[PDB]
Structure formats: structure tokens, C-alpha cells
């Protein structure tokens, strides 16, 4: 939904048996070197922990695994609720030129981050863009950005305008 306003439709389907405490980590976030980030970050060359990914196309997803709101980028942030194959149960029960969104990410019940989007092409910000990785070191900032990307805490906040014309706040590092 536009305007960044979701009322009740987010699916509250999250697990608790596991001791990882992903939900318990919402209140506070650790430092860059305090969470073993570089060990995982070294999986991709400098020049879904980093931009090096091959997200697949996702049409529909069962709500039994969704944990938290599903944020998507027009690139301007947008939230999509559960839907009948409008049900108000809290989950208990395409490129912008062609419509919809290229891709986005969500947080599952098991407690891991998974992403899906458009297919890679073959350099641009409106043709091959699939996820929030607008640039190699720039992300589309949204309120729940830290939760899905705890390793980007050190990134700075920058205001950018993209061309329709979109005004949004992005996070980039030095």
C-alpha cells in the first residue's frame, strides 16, 4: 500500500522453538565486527548478504511462513498484505514499466531472510534492477531495513531522487 500504512494485514506467523532469537534481536542491533559479519561477507568479491545474488521470480507465497510485513520497492517502499486465493486474520488461517515491482525481500517463520525478484539481464537503475540493491553499496531505506540487513548498520543515510520521478531515502556506506 502507498503512503507506508499497513493496518493489521501483516502475517504474525513466527516460530519460537529455535533459540536463535531473531525476533528477540529486534530491540537492539550488534556492531559490525560484533556479529561475525566479515566471515559471511567474504563470500562475494568487493568489486542475501551482499549484492551478489540471483533472485528468482515469485508469483505467490503461502502466508503460513511469512513473519512480519512484506516490504517491496517500486523502488518506493510498498507493503502487500495477505489475500484470498480481503481476509483479516493476521495470517492465522513485474517491472514497474510493465506494472508491479521488480522484486523484494521478506522474513520467514523459520527465521531466515529470503529474496525473490525479476531475472538478471544478460549498469542501470530502471531496467535490470531486481532487489533493493540500487547500486553496489546503496540500499533503499525502509523502517524494517535493519532487521533484514543487520550487516548494514554502519551505512550512512543519504537522500536521492530517481527517474516517472521517485523521491526516496537510500542507505550507502563510505
Amino acid at each position, epitope marked *: 500500500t502507498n503512503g507506508s500504512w499497513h493496518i493489521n494485514r501483516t502475517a504474525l506467523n513466527c516460530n519460537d522453538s529455535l533459540h536463535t532469537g531473531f525476533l528477540a534481536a*529486534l530491540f537492539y542491533t550488534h556492531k559490525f565486527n560484533a556479529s561475525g559479519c566479515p566471515e559471511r561477507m567474504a563470500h562475494c568479491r568487493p568489486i542475501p548478504y551482499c549484492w551478489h545474488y540471483a533472485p528468482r521470480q515469485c508469483g505467490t507465497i503461502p502466508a503460513s511462513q511469512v513473519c512480519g510485513p512484506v516490504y517491496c520497492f517500486t523502488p518506493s517502499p510498498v507493503v502487500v498484505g495477505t489475500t484470498d486465493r480481503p481476509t483479516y486474520t493476521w495470517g492465522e488461517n513485474t517491472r514497474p514499466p510493465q506494472g508491479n515491482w521488480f522484486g523484494c525481500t521478506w522474513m520467514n517463520s523459520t527465521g531466515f531472510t529470503k529474496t525473490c525478484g525479476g531475472p538478471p539481464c544478460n549498469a542501470t537503475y530502471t531496467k535490470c534492477g531486481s532487489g533493493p540493491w540500487l547500486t553496489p553499496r546503496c540500499l533503499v531505506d525502509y523502517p524494517y531495513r535493519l532487521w533484514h540487513y543487520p550487516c548494514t548498520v554502519n551505512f550512512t543515510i543519504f537522500k536521492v531522487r530517481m527517474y516517472v520521478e521517485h523521491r526516496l531515502n537510500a542507505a550507502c556506506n563510505i
Partner: antibody
Amino acid sequence: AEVKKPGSSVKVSCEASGGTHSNYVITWVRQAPGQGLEWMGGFIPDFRTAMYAQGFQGRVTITADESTSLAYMELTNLRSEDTAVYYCARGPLSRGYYDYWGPGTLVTVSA
Amino acid sequence: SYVLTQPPSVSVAPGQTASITCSGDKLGDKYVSWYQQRPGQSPVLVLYQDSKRPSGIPERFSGSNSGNTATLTISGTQAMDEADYYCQAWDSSALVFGGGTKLTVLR
């Protein structure tokens, strides 16, 4: 003003989301006179989940109603050691620091 | 259990600088934040994320976090700076507030 009889229960109320995006985490902190601050628990309006401190595991209870957009905590079995001033705070979603501390609420007993 | 320790009190004269330390075990790997509380008033945030100060607080206040000691530095202290200072940190999914530090200015 009055003495909350021992073994009774008390509640503290904080403003909460009416059933929409919150963009804050509500937590409660108490202060015995001049003895510093202590933490009790937190409650994200967006997520039904909550968090309880180890010390007060058996006496606190956090519940909120979206109809009135008001959240409150229930403390039971008050004792002489629980006399203190109760604060309410609201900070950013994930910055790990609480801002905009509300007014103080005083609760007293008589042993 | 985790504990943060602070000196009970500190004394300085106007125009000088006072150092307040919130030390602990491997405390340099956590984000700290300091709270200033005048008597009879609710605490007001003075520092979040070590050094990034909020808007409104005068530039005199400055702090840092490193090693096992995190310090808050005040320069040009005046008669309006008398207040208790509290330290904050997260550990094992449990908030911990440091012992009250009383900063006094001798006139």
C-alpha cells in the same frame, strides 16, 4: 493518594498504536528513590510478542488494546521493595536507545 | 549476569572539563548511550550510539567508546550541568543501566 494494599495489583498505561504501523518500541523503567534505573520489559505494537526481564518474570504482564490505542502493564503482588517511580519511554525501532521519556508515576505501599 | 560500573561522584570547577567513565567487560563491542537526569525531572537523552549527539544539546558534550571503557567528556562545565548521568547497553537480550554518577560543580 493512597496505599496500594500488599498483595494487590497495579497498572501503568502508555500510548500505543491504534492498529497501524508503529515505528517505535515501548518499554517501561522504574526507579527506586535515588537508587538508579532498572528495566522491566518491552512490547512492539506491530508484533504481538513481548519481552520480560528475568527478575520480574513471575509478577509482570503486558497487554494492550488497539481500540483505545492504549497499552498497559499489570504488576501483581506489590511489596515494600516495589515502591518506586515508574517511567515510560519510546525510542526508534532498532537503534537500541530510548528517547522521549514520559512523566513520572509514583506507586507506594505500606509493607 | 552483567554489570556496568561508574564512579559514585565527580567534582570539578567552572570552566574545566570532567570525564565520566562507564567501564565494563568487553564493553567496546556494544553501542552505548548516556542519559542525563536533573533532580525531579524525567531523564533526557544526551547521547545515542556513542558519539552521535541529538539535535538541541550543546556541542560541549562529547563521548567515545573503545576498549573496556567508554567516556563522556564535558568542556566548559557551568552551573547548569549538575545532574546524574546514566549509562546504557544491551547484553544477552537484557538491558543494563549503570550505577548513578553524580556530577557536581563547585562554585
